[PDB]
Every structure is written in structure tokens, then in C-alpha cells.
Symmetry: D2
Subunit: 60 residues, 4 copies
């Protein structure tokens, strides 16, 4: 996108707290989370979790 922090297929991980790591497979937007991503785990194929951009970092 003309702006999004990450793109489809980027490899990312949660920066802290519960762990999560895998590829970007989607996106979402609400008032509470104006920039969110769906991430498919690279360890557990098919399992997807969603998070706000701030919780995530590209790897790298």
C-alpha cells in the first residue's frame, strides 16, 4: 500500500510478551487499531493471529 508499514509476505514477530512469528497474510482497520495485520505462524501452519502494527517488527 501507498503507506502500510508492512506488506503481504513480510516476515515479522511480536516484539514482546506472548510470542508470535510468521508471515503477513492480511490486514484490518478499526478505530482502536487503525493499522492492524493478520500473521500466519511459521511454526503452526494455518494458524493466524491479528495484532496492531505497534506490536510487530520485521525480521531482518
Amino acid at each position: 500500500p501507498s503507506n502500510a508499514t508492512f506488506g503481504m509476505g513480510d516476515r515479522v514477530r511480536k516484539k514482546s510478551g506472548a510470542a508470535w512469528q510468521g508471515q503477513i497474510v492480511g490486514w484490518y482497520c478499526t478505530n482502536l487499531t487503525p493499522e492492524g495485520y493478520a500473521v500466519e505462524s511459521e511454526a503452526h501452519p494455518g494458524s493466524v493471529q491479528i495484532y496492531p502494527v505497534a506490536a510487530l517488527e520485521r525480521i531482518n
Copy 2:
């Protein structure tokens, strides 16, 4: 999209099993769920859940 079943802002609900109802706020795609949507609950603002297109119906 030139194809997606639903668009941003459509009002939908889960067709069966656990209930869910609200607006489409996002989308995702994996091998297991090639067409998925993120839906923000209309009863619990800020809470989003994701589901495959087949689990959902537009209301209607």
C-alpha cells in the same frame, strides 16, 4: 475487490455454532483459508475475530 464476496463495512454474521455479528473491517488469505475476513463485533466495540468466507453471511 474485483472478486471478494464482501466489502469493507458490510454487515455480516456467523451462520452457525458460536455467534458473531458486526462489520467487515479486514481480510486475510492463507492456503487453508484462501478467502477470510476480519469482523468487528457490533456489540463489543474494538473486538475483532477472523473467519473463512464460508462461515459468514451478509445481513440483509
Copy 3:
């Protein structure tokens, strides 16, 4: 329990951020969340979400 903050069937809600409200239907414990609860939404029957005790308040 001889200690838990809430019991099965208590009515609670998330104190801030994304909303959630319903009845306590379960419990969990990890190093990261040593006292967690499963809560079934009172608006969307069958849908359960889990949270750490600190995120929750009894209503009341």
C-alpha cells in the same frame, strides 16, 4: 478456588480497550498469565475469549 479472584458464572467485563462482557466459564495459567479466565460473551452465545485477571472486572 481457595484463592481465585472470580468463580464460574461470575459476570464480568473488560475494563478498557476492546470490549468484552459475559460470564466466566473457565480458567488458565501460564508464566506470562498466572491467573487467567475464559469468558463467554453474553451478546454472542458460544463465543469465548481469554484474558488475564487484571483486564477484567466483576459487575456489580
Copy 4:
């Protein structure tokens, strides 16, 4: 429990569809899922997902 299929600490995995594997750390019960478990991923510490007993198998 005098009945539960699994106990705290059992190692289990999802039998099919999206993958998940780790240790039992909790439990839940609703009309829709009268016997459910919370499972902490062994690959992503701190991340917990909940499932009905039928979706799970002990490993084994």
C-alpha cells in the same frame, strides 16, 4: 479431574486443519463446548489458544 480427557501439563496437538501443539494450561466449559482446553504453544511461549476436546490429541 474425576473425568476430564486431559490434565494440566499434558502435551497435545490439533488433529487436523490449522496446526497447534503444546501443553494443556487450562480448561473451559460452555453449552457449545462442554469440554474445552486452553493450550499454550510450545513454539511460541505465552501464546494460548482454546479448543474443544474433540479437536485435540495427546502425544504420545
